[PDB]
């Protein structure tokens, strides 16, 4: 697709037979979800944002579908106020910014 | 231009007659820049993200160039760790996500 930015660029994602939605976030290095369904073992990671730093749960080698495009990469579970797909996964689906 | 996402999408901006650099962030509703003076009167605003909230000054109807492309809109100023161009201005220059 070619997605304009008049509203938040939320898209359907699928992980482990759960459908969720998440924002395509060019300002995020990482992909951060509030929760995943029974994802298992993880390691701690710190990330930052405008308000400070948060501790998150890092899961590697996650198979995800983003708007029907298959990808694999790291997903963080943490206290983000909106689920976000960051550049680690945007690159995998060939996403660019264009103007 | 077409901007791939293997690194942060930092671009040149011009605001207040000064060249700066800022992150094009599709996960930002609004534009937030580090402390500067701007013309006109400001009003106080809160914005949120990862790690919590921050206090900013809101300036309306500000001229900004983003890679030479003119926009006019709201610019927030405050203690952000990086200058961020959000959707309020990305839309004005016709920026889209493409995959």
């Amino acid at each position: 697709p070619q997605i304009t930015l008049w509203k938040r660029p939320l898209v359907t994602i699928k992980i482990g037979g759960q459908l969720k939605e998440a924002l395509l976030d060019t300002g995020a290095d990482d992909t951060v979800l509030e929760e995943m369904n029974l994802p298992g073992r993880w390691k701690p990671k710190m990330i930052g944002g405008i308000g400070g730093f948060i501790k998150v749960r890092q899961y590697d080698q996650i198979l995800i579908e983003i708007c029907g495009h298959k990808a694999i990469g790291t997903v963080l579970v943490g206290p983000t106020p909106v689920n976000i797909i960051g550049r680690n996964l945007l690159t995998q689906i060939g996403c660019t910014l264009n103007f | 231009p077409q901007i791939t996402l293997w690194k942060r999408p930092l671009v040149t901006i011009k605001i207040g007659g000064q060249l700066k650099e800022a992150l094009l962030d599709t996960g930002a509703d609004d534009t937030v820049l580090e402390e500067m003076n701007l013309p006109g009167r400001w009003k106080p605003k809160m914005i949120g993200g990862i790690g919590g909230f921050i206090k900013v000054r809101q300036y309306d109807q500000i001229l900004i160039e983003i890679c030479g492309h003119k926009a006019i809109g709201t610019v927030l100023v405050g203690p952000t760790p990086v200058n961020i161009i959000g959707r309020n201005l990305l839309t004005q220059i016709g920026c889209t996500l493409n995959f």
Binding site: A28, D30, G49, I50, I84, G86 | D29, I47, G48, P81
Partner: peptide, 6 residues
């Protein structure tokens, strides 16, 4: 608003 991750 919301501004998103380093």
């Amino acid at each position: 608003x919301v501004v998103x991750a380093x």
